[PDB]
C-alpha cells in the first residue's frame, strides 16, 4: 500500500546559483539555529551543481549543508561553511549536531574555519586552501571527524584536544594535542605518539563511504558507495567512483505525520528510508529486515522512541546502510535504543556488511531520557564509522538518575569494526566489547561527571567502570588512538581506577592509550588494567601507554 518518492518537505532548502537571495537567506537559519543546542526544529542546505559566490555558509545547531553533485567539485563555494563559537564565548566545546558533505570550497582568506566538537561530520569535501580546526582565539574544542576529503593545504587543529581522520588527503597537518589519529590518509603526520601525540596507520582495514542525495541531472537520486578494503585516499578524484545509484522514487520519504508502522510496513513493502529533517516519536521500533536497506537521514533527522521501545533495529541482513540520524531517548526508560542483529545470531556479513555510519545517541539533554543500553551491535562484521553516543552532561533533565544510562556501546558480534567511537559519560561501562576480533581505530571518552561518590560507581574490586572494557574470554582485539577523560565535577575526590579494561593475551593488543583528568576533578590510578601512571596535578597532563600488553 505505501507510495515511493515524492516530496522532500519545507525543511529541506534546494538552493541554486541563481537562486535569489543566498547569504541573507542561509543566514535566517543560523540566526534561530546558531544557540538552539536543543530546539526541535531541523535543517539541511542542499546545493545543485554550478559554482556559487560571495558567500559564507555559517552552520548552527542541527544544520546539516551539501553539495547536490556526483563528486565535491561539481558545487563549488568561492566562500566558506563556517563552524565558529561566538554564541558559547569562544568554547567550542558545545558545538554537536551538524555537518558539511560533497563540496569544494575556495575559503575567502584562504582557510575555512570549521571549529566543532562531537557529532560534526565532515565528510567528501574539497578544501582548496587551509583548514583551521580551532574558534578565533584558540578557545577549547573536542572533535571531531573527517573522511574522505581532500585538504590542499594544512590542516590546523590547534586547540583541539584529539581528532579523526580517514581515507582523506592532506598537504600539511599543523599540530597534536592529545590524539590526533589518521588512517589511510595521504600526507598524514608520520607517526609519533606521545610526540606528538600522532596515531598513524597506513590504511582502513574496510569503509564505505556514507550514501548522500545528488542531482544526477534533473533527477533526485541518491548514490551508495561500495565498500574499500585497505583504503587509502579519497574515492571520488579519479573519475567515476565506486557503488550505486537509487532513484528517489525507490525511497520512502518520511516526514512529520509518519507512524513506525508505516515505515516498517515500507521496508515490508520493498522500499529504503530517507528521513526529512523532523522529529520522529515512534511507539513500536522502527525495524529493517530487508537486505542492502538504506535508512538516510537529513537535517540532523531525529528518532524518539516512546512507551520504553526500542528505536531502531536491524535483522541479520546483510548490507544495511543507516546513516546521518539521532536517536534521543525518551523519558521511559528504554531498554535498547539501537540494536543490530538480534542476541546470538552467528552468521557472516563479510563481503556485504551492515553499517551505523553519523548515528548519533543522546540521552537527556532536551528534558529527561533514559537508557539502559544504547546501542547493541549483535551482527558479524558491522561498521560503526562516526558514532558520538552521549549521556547529556549539560541541559534540561539531567540526573545522576533523571537520565541515567548505565551502558552505551555494547558489542557481541565478531569481526565488528568502528572507526571514530566517540561514548560519554555513562553511569556503568561507556564501550563493552565481547565479540572476537574487534578493531578500533579512534576512541574519545569522557566518565560521568555527576558520580555523587566513590561507592556509587563500585566495579567489584575495581574502582569505577572502564570506558573501555574487553571481556576476559576475549581471545582477539586490537584498537588504535584511545583516550578516557575524567571530571567529577560533583566530587572530585573520586578516584577512576582505569580508562581501559582487557584481558592479557598475545592477540588482545591496544596502541596509544591515554587517560587524562581535566583540572584535578578526580583522578585516574591507572590507564588500563593496573598498568600505566595515575594522573596527578590539577594540570591536565595525560598519563600515556604506547603499547600493551
Ligand atoms: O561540558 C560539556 C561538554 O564538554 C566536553 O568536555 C569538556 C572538555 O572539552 C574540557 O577540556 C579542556 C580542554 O579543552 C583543554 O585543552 C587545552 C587546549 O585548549 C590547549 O590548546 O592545549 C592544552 C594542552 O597543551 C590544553 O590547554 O584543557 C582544559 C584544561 O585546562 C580542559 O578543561 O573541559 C570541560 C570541563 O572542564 C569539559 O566539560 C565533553 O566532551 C562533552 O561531552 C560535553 O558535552
Ligand atoms: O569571511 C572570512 C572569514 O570569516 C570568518 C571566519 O572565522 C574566517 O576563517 C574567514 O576567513
Given at each position: 500500500?505505501?507510495?515511493?518518492?515524492?516530496?522532500?518537505?519545507?525543511?529541506?532548502?534546494?538552493?541554486?546559483?541563481?537562486?535569489?537571495?543566498?547569504?541573507?537567506?542561509?543566514?535566517?537559519?543560523?540566526?534561530?539555529?546558531?544557540?538552539?543546542?536543543?530546539?526541535?526544529?531541523?535543517?539541511?542546505?542542499?546545493?545543485?551543481?554550478?559554482?556559487?559566490?560571495?558567500?559564507?555558509?555559517?552552520?548552527?545547531?542541527?544544520?546539516?549543508?551539501?553539495?547536490?553533485?556526483?563528486?565535491?567539485?561539481?558545487?563549488?563555494?568561492?566562500?566558506?561553511?563556517?563552524?565558529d563559537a561566538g554564541w558559547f564565548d569562544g568554547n567550542a566545546?558545545?558545538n554537536?549536531?551538524?555537518?558539511?558533505?560533497?563540496?569544494?570550497?575556495?575559503?575567502?582568506?584562504?582557510?575555512?574555519?570549521?571549529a566543532?566538537?562531537?557529532?560534526?561530520?565532515?565528510?567528501?569535501?574539497?578544501?582548496?586552501?587551509?583548514?583551521?580546526?580551532?574558534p578565533?582565539?584558540?578557545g577549547?574544542?573536542?572533535?571531531?571527524?573527517?573522511?574522505?576529503?581532500?585538504?590542499?593545504?594544512?590542516?590546523?587543529?590547534?586547540?583541539?584536544?584529539?581528532?579523526?581522520?580517514?581515507?582523506?588527503?592532506?598537504?600539511?597537518?599543523?599540530?597534536?594535542?592529545?590524539?590526533?589519529?589518521?588512517?589511510?590518509?595521504?600526507?598524514?603526520?608520520?607517526?609519533?605518539?606521545?610526540?606528538?601525540?600522532?596515531?598513524?596507520?597506513?590504511?582502513?582495514?574496510?569503509?564505505?563511504?556514507?550514501?548522500?542525495?545528488?542531482?544526477?541531472?534533473?533527477?533526485?537520486?541518491?548514490?551508495?558507495?561500495?565498500?574499500?578494503?585497505?583504503?587509502?585516499?579519497?574515492?571520488?578524484?579519479?573519475?567515476?567512483?565506486?557503488?550505486?545509484?537509487?532513484?528517489?522514487?525507490?525511497?520512502?520519504?518520511?516526514?512529520?505525520?509518519?507512524?513506525?508502522?508505516?515505515?516498517?510496513?515500507?521496508?515490508?513493502?520493498?522500499?529504503?528510508?530517507?528521513?526529512?529533517?523532523?522529529?520522529?516519536?515512534?511507539?513500536?521500533?522502527?525495524?529493517?529486515?530487508?537486505?542492502?536497506?538504506?535508512?538516510?537521514?537529513?537535517?540532523?533527522?531525529?528518532?524518539?522512541?516512546?512507551?520504553?521501545?526500542?528505536?531502531?533495529?536491524?535483522?541479520?541482513?546483510?548490507?544495511?546502510?543507516?546513516?546521518?540520524?539521532?536517536?534521543?531517548?525518551?523519558?521511559?526508560?528504554?531498554?535498547?535504543?539501537?540494536?543490530?542483529?538480534?542476541?546470538?545470531?552467528?552468521?557472516?556479513?563479510?563481503?556485504?556488511?551492515?553499517?551505523?555510519?553519523?548515528?548519533?545517541?543522546?540521552?537527556?539533554?532536551?528534558?529527561?531520557?533514559?537508557?539502559?543500553?544504547?546501542?547493541?551491535?549483535?551482527?558479524?562484521?558491522?561498521?560503526?564509522?562516526?558514532?558520538?553516543?552521549?549521556?547529556?552532561?549539560?541541559?534540561?533533565?539531567?540526573?545522576?538518575?533523571?537520565?541515567?544510562?548505565?551502558?552505551?556501546?555494547?558489542?557481541?558480534?565478531?569481526?565488528?569494526?568502528?572507526?571514530?567511537?566517540?561514548?560519554?559519560?555513562?553511569?556503568?561501562?561507556?564501550?563493552?566489547?565481547?565479540?572476537?576480533?574487534?578493531?578500533?581505530?579512534?576512541?574519545?571518552?569522557?566518565?560521568?561527571?555527576?558520580?555523587?561518590?566513590?561507592?556509587?560507581?563500585?566495579?567489584?574490586?575495581?574502582?569505577?567502570?572502564?570506558?573501555?572494557?574487553?571481556?576476559?574470554?576475549?581471545?582477539?582485539?586490537?584498537?588504535?588512538?584511545?583516550?578516557?577523560?575524567?571530571?567529577?565535577?560533583?566530587?572530585?575526590?573520586?578516584?577512576?581506577?582505569?580508562?581501559?579494561?582487557?584481558?592479557?593475551?598475545?592477540?588482545?593488543?591496544?596502541?596509544?592509550?591515554?587517560?587524562?583528568?581535566?583540572?584535578?576533578?578526580?583522578?585516574?590510578?591507572?590507564?588500563?588494567?593496573?598498568?600505566?601512571?595515575?594522573?596527578?596535578?590539577?594540570?591536565?597532563?595525560?598519563?600515556?601507554?604506547?603499547?600493551?600488553?
Amino acid at each position: 500500500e505505501v507510495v515511493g518518492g515524492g516530496d522532500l518537505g519545507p525543511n529541506v532548502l534546494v538552493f541554486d546559483p541563481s537562486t535569489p537571495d543566498i547569504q541573507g537567506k542561509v543566514d535566517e537559519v543560523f540566526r534561530k539555529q546558531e544557540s538552539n543546542q536543543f530546539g526541535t526544529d531541523r535543517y539541511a542546505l542542499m546545493f545543485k551543481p554550478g559554482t556559487y559566490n560571495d558567500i559564507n555558509a555559517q552552520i548552527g545547531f542541527y544544520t546539516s549543508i551539501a553539495g547536490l553533485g556526483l563528486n565535491p567539485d561539481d558545487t563549488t563555494f568561492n566562500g566558506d561553511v563556517t563552524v565558529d563559537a561566538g554564541w558559547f564565548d569562544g568554547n567550542a566545546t558545545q558545538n554537536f549536531w551538524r555537518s558539511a558533505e560533497n563540496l569544494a570550497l575556495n575559503p575567502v582568506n584562504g582557510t575555512n574555519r570549521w571549529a566543532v566538537s562531537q557529532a560534526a561530520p565532515f565528510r567528501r569535501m574539497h578544501v582548496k586552501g587551509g583548514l583551521n580546526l580551532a574558534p578565533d582565539g584558540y578557545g577549547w574544542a573536542s572533535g571531531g571527524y573527517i573522511a574522505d576529503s581532500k585538504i590542499d593545504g594544512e590542516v590546523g587543529p590547534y586547540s583541539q584536544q584529539q581528532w579523526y581522520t580517514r581515507d582523506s588527503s592532506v598537504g600539511g597537518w599543523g599540530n597534536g594535542v592529545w590524539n590526533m589519529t589518521f588512517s589511510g590518509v595521504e600526507g598524514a603526520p608520520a607517526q609519533s605518539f606521545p610526540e606528538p601525540p600522532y596515531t598513524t596507520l597506513e590504511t582502513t582495514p574496510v569503509s564505505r563511504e556514507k550514501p548522500f542525495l545528488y542531482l544526477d541531472g534533473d533527477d533526485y537520486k541518491v548514490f551508495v558507495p561500495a565498500k574499500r578494503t585497505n583504503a587509502r585516499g579519497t574515492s571520488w578524484g579519479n573519475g567515476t567512483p565506486e557503488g550505486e545509484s537509487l532513484p528517489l522514487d525507490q525511497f520512502y520519504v518520511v516526514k512529520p505525520g509518519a507512524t513506525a508502522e508505516t515505515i516498517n510496513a515500507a521496508v515490508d513493502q520493498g522500499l529504503h528510508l530517507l528521513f526529512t529533517p523532523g522529529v520522529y516519536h515512534v511507539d513500536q521500533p522502527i525495524e529493517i529486515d530487508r537486505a542492502n536497506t538504506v535508512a538516510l537521514g537529513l537535517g540532523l533527522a531525529t528518532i524518539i522512541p516512546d512507551n520504553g521501545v526500542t528505536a531502531l533495529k536491524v535483522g541479520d541482513v546483510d548490507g544495511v546502510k543507516v546513516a546521518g540520524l539521532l536517536v534521543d531517548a525518551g523519558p521511559v526508560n528504554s531498554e535498547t535504543l539501537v540494536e543490530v542483529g538480534s542476541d546470538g545470531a552467528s552468521g557472516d556479513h563479510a563481503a556485504n556488511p551492515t553499517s551505523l555510519q553519523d548515528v548519533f545517541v543522546r540521552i537527556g539533554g532536551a528534558g529527561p531520557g533514559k537508557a539502559t543500553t544504547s546501542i547493541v551491535v549483535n551482527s558479524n562484521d558491522t561498521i560503526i564509522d562516526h558514532t558520538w553516543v552521549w549521556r547529556a552532561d549539560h541541559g534540561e533533565g539531567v540526573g545522576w538518575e533523571t537520565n541515567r544510562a548505565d551502558y552505551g556501546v555494547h558489542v557481541k558480534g565478531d569481526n565488528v569494526l568502528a572507526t571514530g567511537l566517540f561514548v560519554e559519560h555513562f553511569n556503568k561501562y561507556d564501550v563493552q566489547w565481547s565479540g572476537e576480533n574487534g578493531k578500533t581505530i579512534f576512541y574519545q571518552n569522557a566518565k560521568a561527571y555527576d558520580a555523587p561518590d566513590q561507592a556509587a560507581i563500585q566495579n567489584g574490586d575495581i574502582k569505577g567502570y572502564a570506558a573501555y572494557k574487553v571481556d576476559d574470554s576475549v581471545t582477539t582485539h586490537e584498537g588504535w588512538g584511545m583516550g578516557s577523560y575524567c571530571y567529577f565535577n560533583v566530587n572530585p575526590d573520586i578516584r577512576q581506577q582505569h580508562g581501559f579494561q582487557a584481558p592479557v593475551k598475545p592477540g588482545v593488543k591496544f596502541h596509544d592509550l591515554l587517560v587524562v583528568s581535566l583540572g584535578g576533578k578526580g583522578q585516574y590510578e591507572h590507564v588500563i588494567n593496573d598498568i600505566g601512571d595515575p594522573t596527578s596535578g590539577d594540570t591536565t597532563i595525560p598519563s600515556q601507554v604506547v603499547s600493551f600488553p
